[PDB]
Design a protein around this ligand. Structure first.
Ligand SMILES: *[C@@H]1O[C@H](CO)[C@@H](O[C@@H]2O[C@H](CO)[C@@H](O)[C@H](O)[C@H]2NC(C)=O)[C@H](O)[C@H]1NC(C)=O
Ligand SMILES: *[C@@H]1O[C@H](CO)[C@@H](O[C@@H]2O[C@H](CO)[C@@H](O)[C@H](O)[C@H]2NC(C)=O)[C@H](O)[C@H]1NC(C)=O
Ligand SMILES: O=C(O)[C@@H]1Cc2c([nH]c3ccccc23)CN1
Ligand SMILES: *[C@@H]1O[C@H](CO)[C@@H](O)[C@H](O)[C@H]1NC(C)=O
Ligand SMILES: *[C@@H]1O[C@H](CO)[C@@H](O)[C@H](O)[C@H]1NC(C)=O
Ligand SMILES: *[C@@H]1O[C@H](CO)[C@@H](O)[C@H](O)[C@H]1NC(C)=O
Ligand SMILES: [Ca+2]
Ligand SMILES: [Ca+2]
Ligand SMILES: [Ca+2]
Ligand SMILES: [Ca+2]
Lengths: 488, 91
């Protein structure tokens, strides 16, 4: 269907959905002419790295005599641009065959994606209409745990409830009671901020203001929000949002030089390069945020270094990647002899792999379900009368059934199992934004951890000695509505 | 719809609705009445006839999504490569 994709033929096809662009153009349609299309604007290198992770995992599986002998995996990977419409077009392309069959061409056995929660919901409706398994890597909303609506959804990322409980614990740990809240008006910010509100109500914490912001917000809403922020006495603000939806507000705040505010970040924008820029430090320095657990993929960087726009005939996204990396045309003209290590872009300038490891784990979980089908002993199956599933002709519902009961080993030696709701628990790390002494950029220094496996009250660990407040200070700030009443 | 849980030990089948709602039938009859009245009226849209195609949702996303997939067949096949519905009423 959609062009610019990355495709490769095989016996079994796996679909993909990755954000290669942050968003779409701001063109408005007055319906005077026939609506044509919307073009995407800002290239996202991190999404390209996630796509490369998926391709690398598939190629590794295709070269293993151990896993899936005599079977070759193909793929059809599209771009979503963090928008529902493009992902819906790609999903229609995916379910072409099943839709033609039911209502009255390649067949995909499973789909990997997507990043956003609204996009994932819109995709999951259509995919559960046909019982096609869908394993996401970055959707952490709690509404996707409802199995009476989403029947074939699984995720390799933890749920967002423990994160809100952890922010409540962090606020209680420093002995604050006067805070404010900001969330994104989507399926990711509202439930998390509601859970945080409940937890804060439990622990005797007063919330002054609560605002909803969006990437598609006009000047008036931003002015009102910044007036609300200026207009109060609280210095601690909890934000449940992502970088694209948070950029306008941060730009306006850095315009007005609003300083002295302590920010707590959710995992979405705790490492966002759209927010972690030098020109915002005096506003955003000293932020305390969450992060997932890093993983190791041996030989992945070497694969990342081998991109060349001419050799890769199975990846149509590499041309724009090269043009954006080296600023030429393949207004100078590209030669193809440049080196990726030269320019500093998020493609290979990374410290830990957190979402790429999720993509790797999702691909390997699908492969292990396929292997479990391929090794079914006679009369010892998970189907009626102990029957097995023919590996020569497989179907999406059998793969989903094997995914619901899966238990395999990682390369690092850990057990990966989905619960009854298709979720996977994990630890959290707590980081603080500092400034590089030499480079001058924002550095993410770990200050603690949150252990979801412990018991309540012993799940948090923080070193205050490593924490710089507002980026420079060593004294803990003061966020209380009123001063303490003493003896007498 | 019914509460039959899917064990996925056999090929999944379609789900069945349970209770009957007369208020929704009255709303459907209201739509049919409006269309017939418009057709009978000569001043409004002369020399043309208004048709319709109405389905059941059963307060479930899946049934309405199946009906909507039926609604956009021609546009879908045109974009990815039966009379078309100009407008939809619901849900
Ligand atoms: C700000 O207010 C909080 C109460 O919301 C104070 O926390 C109390 O601190 C005392 C002494 O450390 C404890 O005995 C109480 O149990 C705390 N109350 C709680 C946690 O709800 C805090 O001390 C105040 N800080 C300042 C600087 O005024
Ligand atoms: C999640 O965090 C806990 C807490 O740090 C980890 O528990 C540690 O486990 C290692 C060995 O696996 C021990 O050496 C440490 O002493 C433990 N720390 C404790 C108990 O505070 C745990 O391994 C992490 N990961 C998982 C999957 O639970
Ligand atoms: O559900 C959601 O919308 C977020 C999106 C998101 C998360 N982590 C990210 C890292 C980079 C980019 C986007 C994200 C967590 N789940
Ligand atoms: C903030 O307080 C000032 C003080 O009068 C007021 O003029 C302004 O309207 C207030 N803004 C908001 C958003 O409450
Ligand atoms: C903004 O605030 C910082 C911190 O006090 C100060 O150094 C800088 O001069 C201010 N800039 C403007 C334009 O007010
Ligand atoms: C998965 O298998 C391991 C054995 O390697 C077992 O210890 C573990 O309990 C299994 N998972 C579950 C959820 O039972
Ligand atoms: Ca193999
Ligand atoms: Ca996406
Ligand atoms: Ca980002
Ligand atoms: Ca008429």
């Amino acid at each position: 269907g959609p062009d610019q994709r990355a495709q490769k033929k095989g016996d079994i096809i796996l679909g993909g959905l990755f954000p290669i662009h942050f968003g779409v153009a701001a063109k408005d349609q007055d319906l005077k002419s026939r609506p044509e299309s919307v073009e995407c604007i800002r290239y996202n290198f991190r999404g390209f790295r996630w796509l490369q992770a998926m391709i690398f995992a598939i190629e590794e599986i295709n070269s293993s005599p151990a896993l899936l002998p005599n079977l070759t995996l193909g793929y059809r990977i599209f771009d979503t641009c963090n928008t529902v419409s493009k992902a819906l077009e790609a999903t229609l392309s995916f379910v072409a065959q099943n839709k033609i069959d039911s209502l009255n061409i390649p067949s995909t056995i499973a789909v990997v994606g997507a990043t956003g929660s609204g996009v994932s919901t819109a995709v999951a409706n259509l995919l559960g209409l046909f019982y096609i398994p869908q394993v996401s890597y970055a959707s952490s909303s709690r509404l996707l745990s409802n199995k009476n609506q989403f029947k074939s959804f699984l995720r390799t990322i933890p749920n967002d409830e423990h994160q809100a409980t952890a922010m409540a614990d962090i606020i209680e740990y420093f002995r604050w009671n006067w805070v404010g809240t900001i969330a994104a008006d989507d399926d990711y910010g509202r439930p998390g901020i509601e859970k945080f509100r409940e937890e804060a109500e439990e622990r005797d914490i007063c919330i002054d203001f609560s605002e909803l912001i969006s990437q598609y917000s006009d000047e008036e809403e931003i002015q009102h929000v910044v007036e609300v922020i200026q207009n109060s006495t609280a210095k601690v603000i909890v934000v449940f949002s992502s970088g694209p939806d948070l950029e306008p507000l941060i730009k306006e705040i850095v315009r007005r030089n609003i300083t002295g505010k302590i920010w707590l970040a959710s995992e979405a924008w705790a490492s966002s390069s759209l927010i972690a820029m030098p020109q915002y430090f005096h506003v955003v320095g000293g932020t305390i945020g969450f992060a997932l657990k890093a993983g190791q993929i041996p030989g992945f960087r070497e694969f990342l270094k081998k991109v060349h726009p001419r050799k890769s005939v199975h990846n149509g996204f590499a041309k724009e990647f090269w043009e954006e990396t080296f600023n030429c045309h393949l207004r100078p003209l590209c030669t193809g002899d440049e080196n990726i290590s030269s320019v500093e872009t998020p493609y290979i300038d990374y410290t830990h792999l957190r979402i790429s490891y999720n993509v790797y784990l999702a691909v390997y979980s699908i492969a292990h379900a396929l292997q479990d089908i391929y090794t079914c002993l006679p009369g010892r199956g998970l189907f009626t009368n102990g029957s097995c599933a023919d590996i020569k002709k497989v179907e999406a519902w059998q793969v989903l059934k094997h995914l619901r009961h899966l238990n395999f080993t990682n390369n690092m030696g850990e057990q990966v199992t989905f619960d009854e709701c298709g979720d996977l628990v994990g630890n959290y790390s707590i980081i603080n934004w500092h400034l590089s002494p030499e480079d001058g950029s924002i550095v993410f220094k770990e200050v603690g951890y949150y252990n979801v496996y412990a018991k309540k009250g012993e799940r948090l660990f923080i070193n205050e000695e490593k924490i710089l407040w507002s980026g420079f200070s060593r004294e803990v700030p003061f966020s209380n509505c009123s001063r303490d009443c003493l003896a007498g």
